[PDB]
Symmetry: C3
Subunit: 74 residues, 3 copies
Amino acid sequence: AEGVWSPDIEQSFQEALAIYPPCGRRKIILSDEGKMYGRNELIARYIKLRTGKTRTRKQVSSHIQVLARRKSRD
Amino acid sequence: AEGVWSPDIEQSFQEALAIYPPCGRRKIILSDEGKMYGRNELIARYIKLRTGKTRTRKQVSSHIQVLARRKSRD
Amino acid sequence: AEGVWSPDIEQSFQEALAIYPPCGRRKIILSDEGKMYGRNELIARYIKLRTGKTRTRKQVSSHIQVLARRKSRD
DNA sequence: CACATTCCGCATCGATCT
DNA sequence: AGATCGATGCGGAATGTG
DNA sequence: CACATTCCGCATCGATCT
DNA sequence: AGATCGATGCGGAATGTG
DNA sequence: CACATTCCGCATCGATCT
DNA sequence: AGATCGATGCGGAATGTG
């Protein structure tokens, strides 16, 4: 009941969320050359480049799904 | 003569401005699938995801045009 | 031995670094219309839109190459 | 519940084939 | 060499599970 | 003036047509 | 089924307007 | 060393040419 | 008018250089 898992990462995550395609969007353009990334895969790499923590694109696949279940409570 | 319309939104707006294609640019790639957005439409959605306020892509079409008329004063 | 060259710019630069394609990436899509930009060229324009300083895409070509030589020390 | 972990269309992408 | 078709890999939905 | 609101090329995109 | 042509929708310029 | 400055494939892009 | 081929211009590697 304390410091296992972060709330500065939550701000970083939310920065990313906002940066990219806010309430969507662009789908999956890994269609150019020989390494291009997906939406969640970016946000992940953003958080590793803004804290250091490794938080994966499936740790993200999860969280998000979380946050829409919250905006189902009305 | 006080709190009608914001200057934290001005910073958010300017963040967006800088994020996207600084002094331009990329035009209008809503050309992929079945919902992709235009430059100003992004920045708008950025500000709603960073304050909460609804500020539209025409509220932006306006402001900007403002800010180049200022950089006409020399 | 003081204020020649900046460490707030270093944070701005690192913001950009993180924004765009974190540890890469997207190559060089200046392939749309009649003015679209390269990775470093963006980050540069980000820093001029976030401080004011002109720092060029070759001032960047340099720095970076710096920062991987550091992550060669192990 | 806050989580991780199978699913499900997709959409490319390297190898047979008129 | 150009269409054809199994890789493989993503995001997001649907599920485990502690 | 700081604003909102028509314009203007564009550039896709769903429906007739050799 | 593939070119052809009105939708529709954006950003940015040119205008209202309080 | 922290720097700027040639290189090197690339990959578009405006002008000759079946 | 569509392929063909020198522009030109980027990022990143390899070098100057103070």
